PDB file of C-alpha atoms in Angstrom:
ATOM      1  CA  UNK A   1      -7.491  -2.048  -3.645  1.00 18.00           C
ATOM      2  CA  UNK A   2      -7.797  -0.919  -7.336  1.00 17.56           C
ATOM      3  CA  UNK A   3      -4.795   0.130  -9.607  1.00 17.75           C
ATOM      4  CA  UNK A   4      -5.241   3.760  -9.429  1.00 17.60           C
ATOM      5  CA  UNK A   5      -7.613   5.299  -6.962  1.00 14.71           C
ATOM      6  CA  UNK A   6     -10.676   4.744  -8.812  1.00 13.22           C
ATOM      7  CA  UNK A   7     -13.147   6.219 -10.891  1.00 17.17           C
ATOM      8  CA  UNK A   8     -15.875   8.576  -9.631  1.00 19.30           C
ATOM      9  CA  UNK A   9     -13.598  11.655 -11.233  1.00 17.32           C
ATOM     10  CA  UNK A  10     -16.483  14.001  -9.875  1.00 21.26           C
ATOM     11  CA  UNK A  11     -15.450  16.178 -13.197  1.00 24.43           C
ATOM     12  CA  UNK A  12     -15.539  19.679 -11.154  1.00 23.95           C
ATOM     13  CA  UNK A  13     -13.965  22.663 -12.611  1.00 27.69           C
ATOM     14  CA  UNK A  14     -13.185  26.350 -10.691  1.00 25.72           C
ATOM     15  CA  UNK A  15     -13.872  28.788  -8.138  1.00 25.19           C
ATOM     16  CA  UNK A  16     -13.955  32.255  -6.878  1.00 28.71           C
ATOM     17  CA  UNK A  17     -15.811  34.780  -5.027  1.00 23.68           C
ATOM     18  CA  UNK A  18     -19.444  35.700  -4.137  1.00 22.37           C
ATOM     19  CA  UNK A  19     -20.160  31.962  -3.679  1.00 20.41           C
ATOM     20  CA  UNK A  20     -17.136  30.267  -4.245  1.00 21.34           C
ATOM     21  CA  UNK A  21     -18.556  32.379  -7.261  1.00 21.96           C
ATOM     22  CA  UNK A  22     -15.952  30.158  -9.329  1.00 22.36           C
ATOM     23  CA  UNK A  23     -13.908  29.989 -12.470  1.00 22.38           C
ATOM     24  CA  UNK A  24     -10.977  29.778 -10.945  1.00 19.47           C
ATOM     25  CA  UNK A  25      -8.971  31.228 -13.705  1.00 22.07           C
ATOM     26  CA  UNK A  26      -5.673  29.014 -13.403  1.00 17.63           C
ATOM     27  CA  UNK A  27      -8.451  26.556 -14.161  1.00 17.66           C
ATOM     28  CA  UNK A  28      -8.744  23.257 -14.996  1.00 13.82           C
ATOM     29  CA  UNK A  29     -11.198  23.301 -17.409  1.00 14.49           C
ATOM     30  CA  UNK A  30     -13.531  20.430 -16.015  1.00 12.76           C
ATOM     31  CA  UNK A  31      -9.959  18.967 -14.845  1.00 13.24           C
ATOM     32  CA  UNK A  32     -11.161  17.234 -11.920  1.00 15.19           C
ATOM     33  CA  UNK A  33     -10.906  13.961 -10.913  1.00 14.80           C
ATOM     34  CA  UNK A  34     -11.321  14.574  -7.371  1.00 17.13           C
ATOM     35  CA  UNK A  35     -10.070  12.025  -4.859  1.00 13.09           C
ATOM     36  CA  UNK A  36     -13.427  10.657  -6.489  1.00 13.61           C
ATOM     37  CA  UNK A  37     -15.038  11.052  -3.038  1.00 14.63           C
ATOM     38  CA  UNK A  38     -15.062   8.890  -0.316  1.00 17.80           C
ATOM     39  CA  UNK A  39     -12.831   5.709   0.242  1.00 14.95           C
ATOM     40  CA  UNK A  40     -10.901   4.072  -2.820  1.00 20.46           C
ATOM     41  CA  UNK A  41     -13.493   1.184  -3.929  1.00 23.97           C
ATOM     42  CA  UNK A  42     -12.018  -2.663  -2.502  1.00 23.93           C
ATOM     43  CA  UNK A  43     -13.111  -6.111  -2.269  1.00 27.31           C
ATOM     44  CA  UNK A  44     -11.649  -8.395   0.147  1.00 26.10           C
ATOM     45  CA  UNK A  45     -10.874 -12.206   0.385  1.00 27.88           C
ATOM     46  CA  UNK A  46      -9.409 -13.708   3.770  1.00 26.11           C
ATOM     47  CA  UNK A  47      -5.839 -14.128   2.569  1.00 26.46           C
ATOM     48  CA  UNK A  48      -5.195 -16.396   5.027  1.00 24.85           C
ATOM     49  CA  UNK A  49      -7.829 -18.830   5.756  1.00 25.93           C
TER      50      UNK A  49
ATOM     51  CA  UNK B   1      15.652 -33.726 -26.800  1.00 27.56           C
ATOM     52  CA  UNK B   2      16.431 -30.732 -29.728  1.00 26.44           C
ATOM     53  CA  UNK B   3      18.148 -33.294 -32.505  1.00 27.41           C
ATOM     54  CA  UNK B   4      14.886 -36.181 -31.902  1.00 28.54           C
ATOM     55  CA  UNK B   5      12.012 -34.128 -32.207  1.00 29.11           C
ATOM     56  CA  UNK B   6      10.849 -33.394 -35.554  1.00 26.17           C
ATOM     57  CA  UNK B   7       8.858 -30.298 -34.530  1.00 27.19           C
ATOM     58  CA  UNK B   8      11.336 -28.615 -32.101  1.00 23.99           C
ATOM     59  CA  UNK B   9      11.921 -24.678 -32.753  1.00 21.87           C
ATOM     60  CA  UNK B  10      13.781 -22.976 -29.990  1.00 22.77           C
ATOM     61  CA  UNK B  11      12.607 -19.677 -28.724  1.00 26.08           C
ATOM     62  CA  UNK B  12      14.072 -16.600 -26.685  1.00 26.33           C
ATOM     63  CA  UNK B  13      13.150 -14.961 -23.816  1.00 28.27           C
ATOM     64  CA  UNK B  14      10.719 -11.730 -25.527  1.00 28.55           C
ATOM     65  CA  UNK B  15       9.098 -14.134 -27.778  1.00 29.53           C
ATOM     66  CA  UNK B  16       7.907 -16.805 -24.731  1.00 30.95           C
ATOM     67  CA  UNK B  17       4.969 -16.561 -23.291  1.00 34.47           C
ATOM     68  CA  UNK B  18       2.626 -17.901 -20.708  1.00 30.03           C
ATOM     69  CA  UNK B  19       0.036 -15.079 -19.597  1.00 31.19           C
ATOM     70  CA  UNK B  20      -1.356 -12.639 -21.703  1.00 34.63           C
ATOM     71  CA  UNK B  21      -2.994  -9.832 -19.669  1.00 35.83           C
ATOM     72  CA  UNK B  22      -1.654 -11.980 -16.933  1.00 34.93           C
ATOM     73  CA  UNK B  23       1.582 -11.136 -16.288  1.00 36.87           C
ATOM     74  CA  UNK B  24       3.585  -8.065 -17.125  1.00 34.07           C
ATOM     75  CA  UNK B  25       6.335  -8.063 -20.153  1.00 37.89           C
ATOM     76  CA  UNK B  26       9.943  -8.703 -19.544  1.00 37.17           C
ATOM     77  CA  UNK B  27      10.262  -7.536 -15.763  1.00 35.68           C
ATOM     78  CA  UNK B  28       7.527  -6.844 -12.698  1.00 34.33           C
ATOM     79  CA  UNK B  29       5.614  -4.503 -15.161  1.00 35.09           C
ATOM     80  CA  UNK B  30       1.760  -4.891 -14.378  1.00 36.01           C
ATOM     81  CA  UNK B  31      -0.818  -7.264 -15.626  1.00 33.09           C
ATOM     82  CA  UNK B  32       0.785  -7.285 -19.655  1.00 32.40           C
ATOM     83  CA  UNK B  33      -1.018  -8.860 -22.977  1.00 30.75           C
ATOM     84  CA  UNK B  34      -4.360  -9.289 -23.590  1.00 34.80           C
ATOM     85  CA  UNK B  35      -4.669 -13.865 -23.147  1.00 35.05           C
ATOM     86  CA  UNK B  36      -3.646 -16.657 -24.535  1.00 34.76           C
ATOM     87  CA  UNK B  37      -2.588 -20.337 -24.567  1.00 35.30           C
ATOM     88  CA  UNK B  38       0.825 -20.825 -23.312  1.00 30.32           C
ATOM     89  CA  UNK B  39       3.999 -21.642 -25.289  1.00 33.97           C
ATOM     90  CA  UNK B  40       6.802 -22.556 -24.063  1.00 33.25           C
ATOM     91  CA  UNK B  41       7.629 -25.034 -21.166  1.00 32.64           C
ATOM     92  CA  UNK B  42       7.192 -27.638 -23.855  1.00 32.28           C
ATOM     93  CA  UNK B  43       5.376 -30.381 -21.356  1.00 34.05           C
ATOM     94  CA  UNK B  44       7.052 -33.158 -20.382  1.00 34.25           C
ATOM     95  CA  UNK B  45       4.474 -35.324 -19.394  1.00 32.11           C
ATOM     96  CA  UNK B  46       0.805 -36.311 -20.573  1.00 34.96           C
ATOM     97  CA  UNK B  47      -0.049 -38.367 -23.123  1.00 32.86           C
ATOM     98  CA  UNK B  48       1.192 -35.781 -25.078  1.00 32.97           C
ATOM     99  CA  UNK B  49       5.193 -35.733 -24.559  1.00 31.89           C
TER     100      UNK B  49
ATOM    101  CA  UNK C   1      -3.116  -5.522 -27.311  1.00 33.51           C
ATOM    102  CA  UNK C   2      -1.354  -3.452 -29.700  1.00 31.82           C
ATOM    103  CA  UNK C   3      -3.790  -0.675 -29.428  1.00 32.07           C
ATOM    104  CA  UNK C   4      -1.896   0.892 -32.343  1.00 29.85           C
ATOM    105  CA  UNK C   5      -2.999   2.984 -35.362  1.00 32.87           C
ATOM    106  CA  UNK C   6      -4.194   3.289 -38.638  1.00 36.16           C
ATOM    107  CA  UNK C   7      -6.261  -0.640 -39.555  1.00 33.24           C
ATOM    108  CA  UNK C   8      -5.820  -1.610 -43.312  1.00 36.64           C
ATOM    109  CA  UNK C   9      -7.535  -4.190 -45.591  1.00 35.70           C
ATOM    110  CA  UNK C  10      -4.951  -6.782 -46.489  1.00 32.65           C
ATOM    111  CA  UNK C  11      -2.900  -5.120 -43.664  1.00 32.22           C
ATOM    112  CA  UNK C  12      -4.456  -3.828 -40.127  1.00 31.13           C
ATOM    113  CA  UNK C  13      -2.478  -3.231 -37.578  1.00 30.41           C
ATOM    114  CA  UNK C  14       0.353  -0.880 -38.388  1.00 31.19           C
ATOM    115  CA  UNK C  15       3.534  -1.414 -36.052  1.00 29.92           C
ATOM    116  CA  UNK C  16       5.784   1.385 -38.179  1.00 30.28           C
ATOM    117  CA  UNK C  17       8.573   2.630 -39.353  1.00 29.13           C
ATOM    118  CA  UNK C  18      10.960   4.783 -41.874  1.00 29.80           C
ATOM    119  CA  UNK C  19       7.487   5.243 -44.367  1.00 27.55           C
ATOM    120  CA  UNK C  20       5.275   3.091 -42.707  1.00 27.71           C
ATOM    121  CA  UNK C  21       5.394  -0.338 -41.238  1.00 25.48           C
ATOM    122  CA  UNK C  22       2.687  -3.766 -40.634  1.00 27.91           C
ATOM    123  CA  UNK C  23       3.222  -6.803 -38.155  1.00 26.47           C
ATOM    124  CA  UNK C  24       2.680 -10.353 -39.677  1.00 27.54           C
ATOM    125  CA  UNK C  25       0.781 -13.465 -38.546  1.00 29.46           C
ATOM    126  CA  UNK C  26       3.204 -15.698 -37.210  1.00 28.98           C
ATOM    127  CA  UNK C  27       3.490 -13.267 -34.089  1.00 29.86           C
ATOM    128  CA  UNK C  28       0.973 -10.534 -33.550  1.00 29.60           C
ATOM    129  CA  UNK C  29       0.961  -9.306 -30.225  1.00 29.06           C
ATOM    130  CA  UNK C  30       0.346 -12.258 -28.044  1.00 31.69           C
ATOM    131  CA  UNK C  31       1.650 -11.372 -24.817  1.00 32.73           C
ATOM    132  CA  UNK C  32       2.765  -7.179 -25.202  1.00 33.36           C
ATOM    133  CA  UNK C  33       1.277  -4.233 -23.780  1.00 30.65           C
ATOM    134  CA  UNK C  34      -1.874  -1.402 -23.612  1.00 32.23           C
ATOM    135  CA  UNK C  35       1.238  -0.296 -20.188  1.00 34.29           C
ATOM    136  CA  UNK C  36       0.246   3.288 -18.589  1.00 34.47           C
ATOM    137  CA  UNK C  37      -2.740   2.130 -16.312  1.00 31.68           C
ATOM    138  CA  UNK C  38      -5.165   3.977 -18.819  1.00 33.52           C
ATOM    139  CA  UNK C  39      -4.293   4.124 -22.523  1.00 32.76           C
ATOM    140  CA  UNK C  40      -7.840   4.533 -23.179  1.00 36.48           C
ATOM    141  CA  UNK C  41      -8.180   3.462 -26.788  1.00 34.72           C
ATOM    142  CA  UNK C  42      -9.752   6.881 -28.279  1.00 36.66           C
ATOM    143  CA  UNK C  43     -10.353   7.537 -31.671  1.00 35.62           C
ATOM    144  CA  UNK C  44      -8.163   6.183 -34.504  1.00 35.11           C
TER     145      UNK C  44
ATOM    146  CA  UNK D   1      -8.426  25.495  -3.069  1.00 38.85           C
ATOM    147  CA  UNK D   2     -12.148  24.836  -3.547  1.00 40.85           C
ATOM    148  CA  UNK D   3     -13.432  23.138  -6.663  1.00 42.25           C
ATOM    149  CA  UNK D   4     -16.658  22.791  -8.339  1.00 42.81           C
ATOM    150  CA  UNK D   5     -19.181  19.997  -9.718  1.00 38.99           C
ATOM    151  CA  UNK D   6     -20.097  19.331 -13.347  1.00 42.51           C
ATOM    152  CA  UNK D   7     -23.921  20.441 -12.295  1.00 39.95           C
ATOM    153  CA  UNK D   8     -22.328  23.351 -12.397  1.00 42.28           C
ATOM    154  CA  UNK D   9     -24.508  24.728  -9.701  1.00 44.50           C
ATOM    155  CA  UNK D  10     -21.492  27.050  -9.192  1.00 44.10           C
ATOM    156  CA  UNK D  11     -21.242  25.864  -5.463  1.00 43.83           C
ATOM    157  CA  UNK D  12     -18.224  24.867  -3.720  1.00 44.02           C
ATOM    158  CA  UNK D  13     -19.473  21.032  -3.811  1.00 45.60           C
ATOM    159  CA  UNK D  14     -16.017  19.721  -2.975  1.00 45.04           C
ATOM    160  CA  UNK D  15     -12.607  20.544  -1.980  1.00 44.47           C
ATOM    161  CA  UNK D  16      -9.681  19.523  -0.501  1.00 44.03           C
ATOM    162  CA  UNK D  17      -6.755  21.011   1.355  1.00 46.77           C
ATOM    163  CA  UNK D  18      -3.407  20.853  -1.440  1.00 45.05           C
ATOM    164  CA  UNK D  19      -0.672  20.864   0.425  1.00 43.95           C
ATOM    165  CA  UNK D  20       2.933  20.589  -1.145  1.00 41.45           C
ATOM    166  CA  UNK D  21       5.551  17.998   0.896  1.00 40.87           C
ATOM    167  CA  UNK D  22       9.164  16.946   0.349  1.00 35.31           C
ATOM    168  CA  UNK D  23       8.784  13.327  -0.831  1.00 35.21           C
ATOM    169  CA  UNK D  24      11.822  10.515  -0.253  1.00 36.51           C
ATOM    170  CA  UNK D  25      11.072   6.855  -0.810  1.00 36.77           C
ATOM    171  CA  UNK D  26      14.206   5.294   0.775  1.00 33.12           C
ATOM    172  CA  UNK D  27      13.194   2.166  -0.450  1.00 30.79           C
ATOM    173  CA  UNK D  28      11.688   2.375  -4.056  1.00 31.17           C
ATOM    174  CA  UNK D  29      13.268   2.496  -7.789  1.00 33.23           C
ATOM    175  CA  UNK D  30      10.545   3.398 -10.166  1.00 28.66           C
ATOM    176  CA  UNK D  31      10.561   0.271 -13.084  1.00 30.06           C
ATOM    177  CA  UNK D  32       9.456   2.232 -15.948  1.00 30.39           C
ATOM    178  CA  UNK D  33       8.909   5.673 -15.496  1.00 29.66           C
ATOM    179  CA  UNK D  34       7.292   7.022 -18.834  1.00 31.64           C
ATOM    180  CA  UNK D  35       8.302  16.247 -11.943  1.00 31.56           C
ATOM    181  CA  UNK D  36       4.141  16.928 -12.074  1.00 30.99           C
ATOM    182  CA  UNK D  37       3.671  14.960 -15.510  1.00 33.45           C
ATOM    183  CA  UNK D  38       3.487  11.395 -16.148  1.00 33.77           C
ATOM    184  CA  UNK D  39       1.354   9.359 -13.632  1.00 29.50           C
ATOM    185  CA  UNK D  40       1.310   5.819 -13.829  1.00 28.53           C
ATOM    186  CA  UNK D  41       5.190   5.333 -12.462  1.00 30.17           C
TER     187      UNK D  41
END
Protein backbone atom coordinates (compact mmCIF):
# COMPACT_ATOMS: atom_id res chain seq x y z
CA UNK A 1 0.00 0.00 0.00
CA UNK A 2 0.89 3.76 -0.30
CA UNK A 3 1.68 6.11 2.72
CA UNK A 4 -1.55 7.85 2.88
CA UNK A 5 -4.50 6.62 0.92
CA UNK A 6 -3.60 8.05 -2.28
CA UNK A 7 -4.18 10.70 -4.57
CA UNK A 8 -7.27 10.95 -6.81
CA UNK A 9 -8.66 13.80 -4.14
CA UNK A 10 -11.81 13.97 -6.53
CA UNK A 11 -11.76 17.89 -5.32
CA UNK A 12 -15.77 17.94 -4.73
CA UNK A 13 -17.28 20.66 -2.76
CA UNK A 14 -21.24 20.88 -1.29
CA UNK A 15 -24.71 19.97 -1.44
CA UNK A 16 -28.29 20.68 -0.89
CA UNK A 17 -31.68 20.47 -2.21
CA UNK A 18 -33.51 20.34 -5.60
CA UNK A 19 -30.72 18.05 -6.89
CA UNK A 20 -28.50 17.54 -4.22
CA UNK A 21 -28.97 21.27 -5.42
CA UNK A 22 -25.60 21.79 -3.32
CA UNK A 23 -23.51 24.30 -1.50
CA UNK A 24 -23.62 22.76 1.43
CA UNK A 25 -23.09 25.79 3.51
CA UNK A 26 -20.84 24.25 6.41
CA UNK A 27 -18.84 23.75 3.23
CA UNK A 28 -15.68 22.79 2.36
CA UNK A 29 -14.89 24.98 -0.17
CA UNK A 30 -13.58 22.41 -2.87
CA UNK A 31 -12.35 20.50 0.46
CA UNK A 32 -12.59 17.16 -0.86
CA UNK A 33 -10.31 14.60 -1.10
CA UNK A 34 -12.72 11.90 -1.23
CA UNK A 35 -11.65 8.38 -0.29
CA UNK A 36 -10.22 9.22 -3.90
CA UNK A 37 -12.59 6.54 -5.25
CA UNK A 38 -12.18 3.09 -5.50
CA UNK A 39 -9.41 0.89 -3.79
CA UNK A 40 -6.14 2.59 -2.31
CA UNK A 41 -3.57 2.16 -5.40
CA UNK A 42 -0.82 -1.10 -4.50
CA UNK A 43 1.78 -3.03 -6.14
CA UNK A 44 2.70 -6.34 -4.95
CA UNK A 45 5.92 -8.53 -4.80
CA UNK A 46 5.69 -12.26 -3.44
CA UNK A 47 7.25 -11.60 -0.05
CA UNK A 48 8.01 -14.90 0.34
CA UNK A 49 9.24 -16.67 -2.62
CA UNK B 1 42.41 2.57 16.44
CA UNK B 2 41.52 6.58 17.55
CA UNK B 3 45.39 7.57 18.69
CA UNK B 4 46.97 5.71 15.03
CA UNK B 5 44.92 7.15 12.52
CA UNK B 6 45.82 10.44 11.33
CA UNK B 7 42.36 11.24 9.93
CA UNK B 8 40.11 9.92 12.76
CA UNK B 9 37.23 12.48 13.96
CA UNK B 10 34.68 10.91 16.20
CA UNK B 11 31.06 11.57 15.65
CA UNK B 12 27.67 11.34 17.70
CA UNK B 13 24.66 9.76 17.21
CA UNK B 14 22.42 12.99 15.26
CA UNK B 15 25.33 13.76 13.15
CA UNK B 16 25.81 9.82 11.69
CA UNK B 17 24.38 8.84 8.91
CA UNK B 18 23.79 6.04 6.51
CA UNK B 19 20.41 6.65 4.48
CA UNK B 20 19.21 9.76 3.40
CA UNK B 21 15.53 9.53 2.35
CA UNK B 22 16.16 6.03 3.46
CA UNK B 23 15.65 5.77 6.81
CA UNK B 24 13.83 7.98 9.25
CA UNK B 25 15.84 10.46 11.81
CA UNK B 26 16.67 9.46 15.29
CA UNK B 27 13.80 6.81 15.98
CA UNK B 28 11.18 4.65 13.56
CA UNK B 29 10.16 8.05 11.93
CA UNK B 30 9.44 7.34 8.11
CA UNK B 31 11.65 7.30 5.12
CA UNK B 32 14.01 10.67 6.50
CA UNK B 33 16.74 12.78 4.30
CA UNK B 34 16.86 13.23 0.90
CA UNK B 35 20.43 10.51 -0.13
CA UNK B 36 23.66 10.22 0.35
CA UNK B 37 26.95 8.31 0.78
CA UNK B 38 27.29 6.84 4.13
CA UNK B 39 29.52 7.98 7.02
CA UNK B 40 30.13 6.34 9.69
CA UNK B 41 30.86 2.55 10.25
CA UNK B 42 34.36 3.53 9.25
CA UNK B 43 35.09 0.06 7.14
CA UNK B 44 37.20 -2.27 8.38
CA UNK B 45 38.09 -4.12 5.53
CA UNK B 46 38.92 -3.47 1.70
CA UNK B 47 41.81 -2.30 0.39
CA UNK B 48 40.85 0.65 1.94
CA UNK B 49 41.21 0.06 5.92
CA UNK C 1 15.80 18.30 2.56
CA UNK C 2 15.58 21.34 4.52
CA UNK C 3 12.70 22.64 2.59
CA UNK C 4 13.19 25.86 4.57
CA UNK C 5 12.80 29.57 3.67
CA UNK C 6 14.02 32.58 2.38
CA UNK C 7 17.46 31.44 -0.34
CA UNK C 8 20.28 34.14 -0.26
CA UNK C 9 23.33 34.83 -2.48
CA UNK C 10 26.41 34.16 -0.41
CA UNK C 11 23.90 32.51 2.03
CA UNK C 12 20.74 30.21 0.88
CA UNK C 13 19.25 28.25 3.06
CA UNK C 14 18.16 30.03 6.19
CA UNK C 15 17.94 27.62 9.35
CA UNK C 16 17.05 30.78 11.92
CA UNK C 17 17.07 32.31 14.82
CA UNK C 18 16.95 35.48 17.40
CA UNK C 19 17.26 38.00 13.93
CA UNK C 20 17.85 35.56 11.48
CA UNK C 21 20.01 32.54 11.10
CA UNK C 22 22.13 30.37 7.90
CA UNK C 23 23.50 26.66 8.05
CA UNK C 24 27.18 26.17 6.86
CA UNK C 25 28.91 23.68 4.54
CA UNK C 26 30.50 21.28 6.62
CA UNK C 27 26.90 19.85 7.46
CA UNK C 28 23.91 20.90 5.45
CA UNK C 29 21.16 18.68 5.81
CA UNK C 30 22.43 15.32 4.83
CA UNK C 31 20.24 12.96 6.42
CA UNK C 32 17.09 15.39 8.19
CA UNK C 33 13.64 15.75 7.28
CA UNK C 34 10.64 17.20 4.65
CA UNK C 35 8.47 14.70 8.06
CA UNK C 36 4.47 15.22 7.76
CA UNK C 37 3.78 12.80 4.74
CA UNK C 38 3.11 16.00 2.53
CA UNK C 39 5.03 19.21 3.23
CA UNK C 40 4.43 20.13 -0.23
CA UNK C 41 7.13 22.69 -0.92
CA UNK C 42 4.76 25.79 -1.99
CA UNK C 43 5.85 29.06 -2.64
CA UNK C 44 8.80 30.70 -0.85
CA UNK D 1 -23.64 13.71 3.63
CA UNK D 2 -23.46 13.94 -0.16
CA UNK D 3 -20.64 15.79 -1.86
CA UNK D 4 -20.03 17.18 -5.18
CA UNK D 5 -17.39 17.03 -8.20
CA UNK D 6 -15.11 19.84 -9.39
CA UNK D 7 -17.22 19.67 -12.92
CA UNK D 8 -19.36 21.19 -10.88
CA UNK D 9 -22.26 19.68 -12.66
CA UNK D 10 -23.98 20.31 -9.29
CA UNK D 11 -24.85 16.49 -9.05
CA UNK D 12 -24.41 14.36 -6.15
CA UNK D 13 -21.34 12.52 -8.02
CA UNK D 14 -20.09 10.98 -4.79
CA UNK D 15 -20.72 10.41 -1.24
CA UNK D 16 -20.14 8.49 1.54
CA UNK D 17 -21.86 7.54 4.76
CA UNK D 18 -19.73 9.71 7.90
CA UNK D 19 -20.24 8.00 10.69
CA UNK D 20 -18.61 9.05 14.11
CA UNK D 21 -17.04 5.86 16.37
CA UNK D 22 -15.27 5.64 19.73
CA UNK D 23 -11.68 4.80 18.70
CA UNK D 24 -9.10 2.73 21.26
CA UNK D 25 -5.86 1.36 19.89
CA UNK D 26 -4.84 -0.93 22.80
CA UNK D 27 -1.75 -1.45 21.23
CA UNK D 28 -0.32 1.81 19.60
CA UNK D 29 1.76 5.00 20.99
CA UNK D 30 1.76 7.62 18.34
CA UNK D 31 5.90 8.51 17.69
CA UNK D 32 5.53 12.02 16.79
CA UNK D 33 2.31 13.42 16.84
CA UNK D 34 2.62 17.05 15.30
CA UNK D 35 -8.51 15.84 18.15
CA UNK D 36 -9.71 16.48 14.16
CA UNK D 37 -6.37 18.43 13.20
CA UNK D 38 -3.07 17.16 12.40
CA UNK D 39 -3.00 14.04 10.09
CA UNK D 40 0.07 12.40 9.46
CA UNK D 41 0.42 10.81 13.27
Amino acid sequence: FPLGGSAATDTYSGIKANGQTWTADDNYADRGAEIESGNIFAMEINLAA
Amino acid sequence: NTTTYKEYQNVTLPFQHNNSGFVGYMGPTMREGQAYPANYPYPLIGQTA
Amino acid sequence: PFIGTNINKDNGIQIGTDTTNQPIYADKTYQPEPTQWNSEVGAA
Amino acid sequence: QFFALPSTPNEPKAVLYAENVSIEAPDTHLVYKPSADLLTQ
